[PDB]
Design a protein around this ligand. Sequence first.
Ligand code: MG
Ligand code: MG
Ligand code: MG
Ligand code: MG
Lengths: 239, 246, 239, 246
Amino acid sequence: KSALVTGASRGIGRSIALQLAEEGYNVAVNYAGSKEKAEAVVEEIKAKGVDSFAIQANVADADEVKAMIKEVVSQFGSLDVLVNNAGITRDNLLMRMKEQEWDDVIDTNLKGVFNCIQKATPQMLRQRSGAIINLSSVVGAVGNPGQANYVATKAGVIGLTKSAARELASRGITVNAVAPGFIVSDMLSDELKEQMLTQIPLARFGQDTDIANTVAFLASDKAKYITGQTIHVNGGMYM
Amino acid sequence: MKMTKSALVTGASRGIGRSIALQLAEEGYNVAVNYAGSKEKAEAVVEEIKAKGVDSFAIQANVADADEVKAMIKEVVSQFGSLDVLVNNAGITRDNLLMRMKEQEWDDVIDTNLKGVFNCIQKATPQMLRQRSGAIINLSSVVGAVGNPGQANYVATKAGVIGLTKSAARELASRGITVNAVAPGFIVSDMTDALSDELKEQMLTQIPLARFGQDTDIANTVAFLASDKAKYITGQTIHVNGGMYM
Amino acid sequence: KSALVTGASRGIGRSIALQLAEEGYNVAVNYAGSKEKAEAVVEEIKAKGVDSFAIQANVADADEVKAMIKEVVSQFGSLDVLVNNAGITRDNLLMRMKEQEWDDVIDTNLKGVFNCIQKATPQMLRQRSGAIINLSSVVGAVGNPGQANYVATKAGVIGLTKSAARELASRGITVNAVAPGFIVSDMLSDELKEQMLTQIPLARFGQDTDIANTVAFLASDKAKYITGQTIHVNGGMYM
Amino acid sequence: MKMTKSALVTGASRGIGRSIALQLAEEGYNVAVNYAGSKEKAEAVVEEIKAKGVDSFAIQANVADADEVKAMIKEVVSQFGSLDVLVNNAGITRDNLLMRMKEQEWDDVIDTNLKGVFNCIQKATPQMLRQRSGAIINLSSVVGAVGNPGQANYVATKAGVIGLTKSAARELASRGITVNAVAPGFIVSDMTDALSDELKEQMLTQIPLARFGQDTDIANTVAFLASDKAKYITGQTIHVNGGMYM
Ligand SMILES: [Mg+2]
Ligand SMILES: [Mg+2]
Ligand SMILES: [Mg+2]
Ligand SMILES: [Mg+2]
């Protein structure tokens, strides 16, 4: 069994890769930025006793994504789990937001998930199996001032999740999303943090591992009847 | 008669956009009719609107183009003196199976449907902040909430529009502006009718009221959200779909 | 056209009745408590140029509700709009909540809506038309400490709304709900109110008329294709 | 082997409740098996559970009865020393068309399904506050989210259970307790099979995965929520339904 995680060089992506490796998956580590950080994650994954390698690719670019999937399948022999975790923010108030701030976030976060799903589908259709897990965010469900672009993409990812789920269900593929709340890795002044904590019933920020554990559950045989769903992992801030 | 309040409707040359424009006119709004291609259809709608006794004119703009949208808003505010209601109705489809969908089919739908809504909201914002009032109503779709095979691009945009609705709602609320969405179900005017009766039959089985909806059903809900009757409603998506999604 | 509004002697119920009367509806005013307050509402309604009368009935009691509907139909000739607005709270923390605090709220708020819908259905089926509008609450969607009973009923009312909508749609009846946020009539220290205001994007409490306007829209020909829906009227506190 | 952690499952003598109990046992929880009527079935499940290597016993209680529930919780805490997981699975149906449904059909379903869940949560609360930890998982249903003709009572309770889930979640969060719900779709064990294949065919058309689910699908999700893997998930309803509702 083989998995690919996008934007896996650090934070939630890395934790996801490490957890999948803990479950017995071979894991390909996609990255955009630092090679050495990605290579370190690959070594951490190998320490779990599975195979791993890093692949550089901009998920916004359909050609690069196609080459990425082809390499994973070439190397691992299959593609059983795809985790679309890569994402960026370029925050600004509505009136101040630049066109490139919109475009960059939409192409990376929304088109990137589409690209990865699209390029992975032919392999999964031939397998007649697969699990795709997309990362959304609590703000995709509730909105947030200053992030109109990011919110649009994470809500859009939920819609894409549902559509892909309905389209691919007949061929044995599940498609789900995980929406983190306020997670320590993603983390500000202690004053701002204090206010954010008042929004959270559990009264603490979540950890990378909370997100990774949920993704791993969705990628497992234990979740084979779950599809089209968004699992909110947010300490109760949105219910 | 030039009304004290004015509306802009995007993609208003036919179907749902046209009925919305006509309904806003009936409610006493001057209405600007935006169109992309067919000027003749837009100008006929303008005449229908003036027959209601309000002012109207047609404006050509591609909503995906930030600069055309800015010029469009400036022209509406210039002609009418304000922009009290913005209805983001313009949208296209480029349907295809996931594994076949062309990059251009994805891009065009995202730019018109999602970026278009962002552009219109962004460019309208300064005027509405100046007014300390306004209503923005965005058109989504039932498929934005439930997904639909063959429409992954369109679905992504209509879900994205609901997100954008909530974000703009939170950002603009404190200055007196509401932002909401309406999600039509299966509406007769959105159908080519090229599809067989058996396909119609199947779609009808999804709808408890066992009929397709009409443009006016959507228009009436938009007009409600655009009225003082709905001043405490914001960030909401109103589904008008005969019960097919609850 | 004839309407019945439960718990209409004051607050949101009264405002709803007055608005329906403004729309040309004859309106029956159901009440549980003070007769003179209800009679005053009936006079206010008559001032709009429509017919009106008050009926005493505990909505938790199926016999009394049956007699209530029968009287409305007898008097008006039909029952075109039913607004289930009657509801109570008996707040307490989970560990402190008494059995009667649970039972009273469930029977009034949830069984009461069921009773009214059930007893109204035979008339509406014979008409092959009608609009039923149930009152929920933002807390039905988000929960609230100290109101486990109330929350259960208002979420339950949403479920009942959907089920009735699906069951009655084929006979020309729509069934919808309206969920108010924090409304001035329902209203505390200015300190508590200040905190509640921080939960509301519009930064103000809503008014009875906001709820009444939405109910009136749902009861009108303009909403004939809307059914099974919950309309949140809450200034953006829940989206 | 007596585990360090213990679970109570209501209505666990068969179907979904039984699979949940067995799955929790496999995860290393001592499991108490609650039943209302059939003691023989409950005791057989107890033996299946002990075969997994954990402790188990059967307890009779009507969940609608606050006093029986209190005695039940006391007995579990007494036997096991704690109550770390509470699964509120017990529930009944009394189906009928709206205009025909008997008052007793409404009352019995509300008392068992909705009041029963409240009673169990209320009586478990003191022990879990004492522990400063615990997981409560409530069983809802897809029909709680979408409605279903002929089940207005059952639907009201399953929607009510989601509300109760969110309210208890908010109230208990600060003291280390999570409260979530699982909403099964159409599961083979919930069907009498008395229904025709054509009725089955129709139900299958609502499900993208084009198969009914199994008890184990529900059990696995409950076990996930009951684990340390889900400590930051609270107030949520997880739909396990093959895509029929998204
Ligand atoms: Mg024409
Ligand atoms: Mg559109
Ligand atoms: Mg047996
Ligand atoms: Mg149950």
